A paper describes a structure:
β-lactam antibiotics, including the extended-spectrum cephalosporin (ESC) ceftriaxone, are analogs of the d-Ala-d-Ala C terminus of the peptidoglycan substrate and as such target [name] by binding to and reacting with the active-site serine nucleophile (Ser310 in N. gonorrhoeae [name]) to form a covalently acylated complex. [name] is comprised of an N-terminal membrane anchor, a putative pedestal domain, and a C-terminal catalytic TPase/β-lactam–binding domain. The TPase domain of [name] contains a central five-stranded antiparallel β-sheet surrounded by α-helices on both sides. β3 contains the conserved Lys497Thr498Gly499 (KTG) motif that twists during β-lactam antibiotic binding to form the oxyanion hole for acylation.
To understand how pH affects the structure of tPBP2, we determined the crystal structures of tPBP2∗ at pH 7.5 and 9.5 and of tPBP2∗–[name] at pH 7.5. By contrast, there is continuous electron density for the entire β3–β4 loop in molecule B, indicating that it is ordered, and it adopts an extended β-sheet conformation projecting away from the molecule. Importantly, the loop is ordered in the structure of the [name] mutant, even though these data were collected from crystals buffered at pH 7.5.
Residue numbers in the entry: 236 to 282, 296 to 505, 509 to 573
The structure:
């Protein structure tokens, strides 16, 4: 009747509490979607006061980067061969920096290493109004109308109020806010070959009519780029799943005072990367023990939830098991 798959939800709820307790976090959330139909297979929240996946508005941090890269590729403002100067720079007083000083990176490196500089430079190739409409067409600031009271629209500030630094920080996930469900929805544009899905709490006999945001070719090429995140040399190797190519993104969103230690560890990805079937999104709110970063904190729960979901759904491994 409903789209909930109890086998996946119980797996997700248990793996979530495991991670939340181990790292002594304030809260956590997991979303599992059918990557081809948008059916919500699992929605787990801890300490399960409210449905945080739908209600809690967060700055996504680095999790939004693949959409800026996809947009730059879709419109032809960059390509897969271009190497971008990724030295840290400033816009007036405000700095734009990565964790490491990379002299140059292509779009694959920007995804792989999670480069704020590279992503902001690609975004700066669009006008403020262009990015505003892009973010709004991704559903940022658009209510899900899931039915749960306390649902949030999200925050997308009017483009006319954007300072140049603010457009830059939005490109790597600060200055706009959305729920984990909204963020998981947006990734259907990458898995469903450029077509954004509306999501559904009930079973779907066929994928509903979505809305195209990217060319099919753009979505496929971006998916390949994101597999470098879980492969050695990427920030999300802790989310690799045995027997699959996993395209994913990690982020450590910082919170208001931006604090250097209070942060929401995020890990979101899909598999099988080339022909995705499952989206898994994990957020761990304010971990205080055994790590800080989305990769190390939310990676392991993603790994087990993704691998179990693929197994539960009977998805054949693409590579030999180890």
């Amino acid at each position: 009747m409903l789209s909930l798959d109890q086998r996946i939800q119980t797996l997700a709820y248990e793996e979530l509490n495991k991670a939340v307790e181990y790292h002594q976090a304030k809260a956590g959330t997991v979303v599992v979607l059918d990557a081809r139909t948008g059916e919500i297979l699992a929605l787990a929240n801890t300490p399960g006061g409210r449905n945080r996946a739908v209600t809690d508005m967060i700055e996504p941090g680095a999790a939004i980067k693949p959409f800026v890269i996809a947009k730059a590729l879709d419109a032809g403002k960059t390509d897969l061969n271009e190497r971008l100067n990724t030295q840290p720079y400033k816009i007036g007083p405000s700095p734009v920096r990565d964790t490491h000083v990379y002299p140059s990176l292509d779009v694959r490196g920007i995804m792989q290493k999670s480069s704020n500089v590279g992503t902001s430079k690609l975004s700066a190739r669009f006008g403020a109004e262009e990015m505003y409409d892009f973010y709004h067409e991704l559903g940022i600031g658009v209510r899900m109308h899931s039915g749960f009271p306390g649902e949030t629209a999200g925050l997308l500030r009017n483009w006319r109020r954007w300072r140049p630094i603010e457009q830059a920080t939005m490109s790597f996930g600060y200055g706009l806010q959305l729920s984990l469900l909204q963020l998981a929805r947006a990734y259907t544009a990458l898995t469903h070959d450029g077509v954004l899905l509306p999501l559904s709490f009930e079973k779907q006999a066929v994928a509903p009519q979505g809305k195209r945001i990217f060319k099919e070719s753009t979505a496929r090429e971006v998916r390949n780029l994101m597999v470098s995140v879980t492969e050695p040399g990427g920030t999300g190797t802790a989310g690799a799943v045995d027997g699959f190519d996993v395209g994913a993104k990690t982020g450590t969103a910082r919170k208001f005072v931006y604090a250097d230690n209070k942060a929401v560890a995020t890990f979101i990805g899909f598999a099988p990367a080339k022909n995705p079937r499952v989206i898994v999104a994990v957020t761990i709110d304010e971990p205080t023990a055994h790590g800080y970063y989305g990769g190390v904190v939310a990676g392991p729960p993603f790994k087990k939830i993704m691998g179990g979901s693929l197994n539960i759904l009977g998805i054949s491994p693409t590579k030999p098991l180890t």
